[PDB]
Amino acid sequence: FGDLSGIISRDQFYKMLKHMNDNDCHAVGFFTYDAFITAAKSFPSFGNTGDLAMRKKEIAAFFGQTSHETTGGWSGAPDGANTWGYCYKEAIDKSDPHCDSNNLEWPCAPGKFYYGRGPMMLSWNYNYGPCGRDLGLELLKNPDVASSDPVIAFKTAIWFWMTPQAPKPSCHDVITDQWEPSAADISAGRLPGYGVITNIINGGLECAGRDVAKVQDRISFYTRYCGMFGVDPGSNIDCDNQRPFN
Ligand SMILES: [Cl-]
Ligand SMILES: [Cl-]
Ligand SMILES: [Cl-]
Ligand SMILES: [Cl-]
Ligand SMILES: [Cl-]
Ligand SMILES: [Cl-]
Ligand SMILES: [Cl-]
Ligand SMILES: [Cl-]
Incomplete structure (x- = not known):
């Protein structure tokens, strides 16, 4: 199953x-x-x-x-x-950190960029955060694992x-x-x-x-x-x- x-x-x-x-x-x-x-x-x-x-x-x-x-x-x-x-x-344009600070729960890691990665082109700290928590991955600290x-x-x-x-x-x-x-x-x-x-x-x-x-x-x-x-x-x-x- x-x-x-x-x-x-x-x-x-x-x-x-x-x-x-x-x-x-x-x-x-x-x-x-x-x-x-x-x-x-x-x-x-x-x-x-x-x-x-x-x-x-x-x-x-x-x-x-x-x-x-x-x-x-x-x-x-x-x-x-x-x-x-x-x-x-992943996104072609990787220049934007995609870090949202409004109603902030999910910290952006310095020097890391939350541009689109993977089949759904997952973007922004407020997606990488809860996704990483649910999957047990440190996606905020190392978001490139989602495309490696x-x-x-x-x-x-x-x-x-x-x-x-x-x-x-x-x-x-x-x-x-x-x-x-x-x-x-x-x-x-x-x-x-x-x-x-x-x-x-x-x-x-x-x-x-x-x-x-x-x-x-x-x-x-x-x-x-x-x-x-x-x-x-x-x-x-x-x-x-x-x-x-x-
Ligand atoms: Cl059908
Ligand atoms: Cl399944
Ligand atoms: Cl990055
Ligand atoms: Cl295969
Ligand atoms: Cl078509
Ligand atoms: Cl439409
Ligand atoms: Cl419609
Ligand atoms: Cl139909």
Whole structure:
């Protein structure tokens, strides 16, 4: 129980991530199926909640979102932009420390930068802190471990997926039909669906029509992957008519 090898095979993993080992990509040989499988064993509920179709849809949504975060695709890329997931393992621009001091719980270590790392492009002291505590890693003091070890990389992404950050539910709860939207969520058009997941991850900079291009890219990866798993993507897939969470 908690081994996802029966739900997603090695062959499906590398077909999804068709171009991640290409010359045009940057984390060649870094993200492996073995690493993903190992990481997932640490979050037993992930990919093991609901019936077969639900389990597959969770994996499709997780890869849809992380593919976008790490994408190196472009219009006219070989086999389509939605085949270029996992091309990066961290932010290109590493100049910003990403240290937030408002309502500070999580100390920034001097000379350390909390730019995007790993499949979810985990950023900011207020993510590295609780993630490191939950995983037993000193991620604040050494945030580069999240991009030097593929299992750790995946564990940071799955941690993010599984962890609610009020008022946002976990991505896991949304995709497994466990999230009960508040009446504010409903009046805001945040209905359960992949669109809310986009909203959780980066809604402030993308949803309500703020960046249609990025949202469309998230959706293209997701629908491709759903087609490969033979599951239905569902409704409320877009977030252009949703207010961001805050
Ligand atoms: Cl699991
Ligand atoms: Cl492998
Ligand atoms: Cl596409
Ligand atoms: Cl650093
Ligand atoms: Cl949008
Ligand atoms: Cl289905
Ligand atoms: Cl559908
Ligand atoms: Cl919407």
